[PDB]
Paper text:
We have focused our work on the iron(II)/α-KetoAcid-dependent Oxygenases (αKAOs), a mechanistically diverse superfamily of enzymes that use dioxygen as the oxidant to catalyze several reactions via C-H bond activation, mostly hydroxylation. These enzymes operate with three substrates, dioxygen, α-ketoglutarate (α-KG) and a primary substrate. One of these, KDO1, catalyzes the formation of (3S)-3-hydroxy-L-lysine, while five others, KDO2 to KDO6, promote the formation of (4R)-4-hydroxy-L-lysine. We based our analysis on the structures that we solved by X-ray crystallography of two of the regiodivergent αKAOs active towards L-lysine, namely KDO1 from Catenulispora acidiphila, that catalyzes the C-3 hydroxylation, and KDO5, from Flavobacterium sp., that catalyzes the C-4 hydroxylation.
The size of the KDO1 pocket is smaller than that of KDO5 due to Ser168 (instead of Gly). In the absence of the α-KG, unlike what is observed for the lysine-KDO1 complexes, the lysine is positioned differently in the four molecules of lysine-KDO5, suggesting that this substrate is not properly stabilized.
Author numbering: 34 to 358
Amino acid sequence: EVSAILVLTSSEASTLERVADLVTAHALYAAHDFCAQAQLAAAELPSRVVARLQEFAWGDMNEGHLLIKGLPQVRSLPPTPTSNVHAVAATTPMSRYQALINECVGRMIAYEAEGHGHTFQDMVPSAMSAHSQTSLGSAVELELHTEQAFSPLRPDFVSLACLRGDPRALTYLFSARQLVATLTTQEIAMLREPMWTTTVDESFLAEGRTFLLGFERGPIPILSGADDDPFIVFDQDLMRGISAPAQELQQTVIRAYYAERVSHCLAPGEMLLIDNRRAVHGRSIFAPRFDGADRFLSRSFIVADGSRSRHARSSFGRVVSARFS
Ligand SMILES: N[C@@H](CCCC[NH3+])C(=O)O
Ligand SMILES: N[C@@H](CCCC[NH3+])C(=O)O
Ligand SMILES: [Cl-]
Ligand SMILES: [Fe+2]
C-alpha cells in the first residue's frame, strides 16, 4: 500500500556499507560522538539518496513517511531479545546504516523515559506486555497514535530499521492529508480547536517519576499548521474530548483511519521513516513465538532542532531527561 519508496541500488547500498566504517564511536556509551560522526559521514552518501532524504526532511507535501529498501543485509544477527532492556540493535551494522540515513534527515535524540534513553531501542515482542498499548505488544492491535502525543518535545521523525520481520505484523500509516480529504469543513475546523486532553504513555511512567507538565495535558487541538499541509497530534487510546461533539469527532478520525490507512509489512534490509508531524501510525496483531527469531526492529528518534531540547539535556548529551517529557 505504501507510496513513498526509496529503493537503494546495489552500488548505493555498497557506498552506505563503506561510509558506515567512518562511524566508530559507541552508539550507547558515546551517543553524541556517534551521532556527530554519522552527521559528518552522511556527506559521503550517494547524492540521489541525500537529495531524497533532504526533500523528505523539508516536509512540504511529503507523504507522511518514506520507506527505504535495499539497505545492506545484516549477516550475523544475534537472537531477538525477549525484552527491550538489552539494547541489542545498537551493536549491529544496521544501526550505523540507520544513523547515516537518520543524520541526513535531522539530529538523533533519545528520551530517558523511553527505552532507558538507548540511542536505538529494541522493538521486540514482550510476553508480559503482549496485550498492552506499547511498542512491545503483539496480541492486540497497537492503536492509532502520534509518537509521544502528550509531549511538546515529541520527535519530528520516528526511524524504524527492520532486523527481523513477522509476516503478520503490518505497520499502518495514515497522513493528516488523508484525514482532511474525508472530512467536512466544520469537522476540520473543530479538529483545529483545543478540545482534547492527553495523558503520558504507559512506557513513560515509573516509580517516583514526576513530569514538570503533569500526567494529564491539554486540552490541545488534533490538527494545526497550513490548510494544505496539516500537522496532527492524535492518540486513539489516550485522547479524551472535553465535550460530546469532541468525543464524536475523535471516533470520526478513527473511522477515517480504518477506511484509508496504508499497510506495509517491514522486512529485513528495510527502513521506515515516519514524519511524526504529518502522519499517525499503528500496528496489527501478530503471534510471536519468543524463540529468539521474532520480529525485531531498531527504533530511533529524529529532531530537526537540537536547541529545543537543550534545557532538557546535558551539554554534548543526546538524552532528554524524564521530567521534561
Ligand atoms: N509510542 C508507544 C506506543 C503507542 C502508545 C500510544 N499511547 C511505545 O513506544 O510504547
Ligand atoms: N513506592 C515509593 C514511592 C514512589 C512514588 C510512587 N510511584 C516509596 O518507597 O514510598
Ligand atoms: Cl524536540
Ligand atoms: Fe509508537
